[PDB]
DNA sequence: CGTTGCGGCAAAGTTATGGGTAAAGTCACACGTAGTCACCATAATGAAATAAGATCACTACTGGGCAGTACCAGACTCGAACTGATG
């Protein structure tokens, strides 16, 4: 019952150790939204999201 | 024994009481008795009103994200050219 942006900002991003994750979790996590394609990619960000 | 007063005995006399029978009184039939306020509690609405409830409008306070900007490479693709085998 929460918005996916809210879930990413308040539940996922603090759990991610990356600096930009924590920083953008408090001014609008537009970095993870403008590049939502890479969340499904082969790379490190996709694997981090799965973890 | 003769007389006189006294007392028992049993009709006789006097009141009283509950019955019957003719005969003097008594009284309703005469259009008429029912009829009428006064009385205070209970149901029973209908109106008066509720006390709270419902919504509008305004004022102030405080979370807080989106369109846009920016870099640092890694990696695939391919002009343009080099160079070797060959019929």
UniProtKB/TrEMBL annotation:
Please, which domain of life does this record's source organism belong to? Bacteria
Name of this protein: Uncharacterized protein
Please name the source species. Answer: Nostoc sp. 'Peltigera membranacea cyanobiont' 210A
């Amino acid at each position: 019952g929460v918005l996916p942006g809210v879930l990413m900002t308040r539940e996922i991003a603090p759990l991610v150790n990356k600096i930009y994750f924590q920083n953008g979790a408090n001014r609008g996590f537009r970095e993870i939204f403008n590049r939502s394609q890479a969340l499904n990619g082969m790379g490190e960000m996709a694997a981090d999201l799965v973890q």
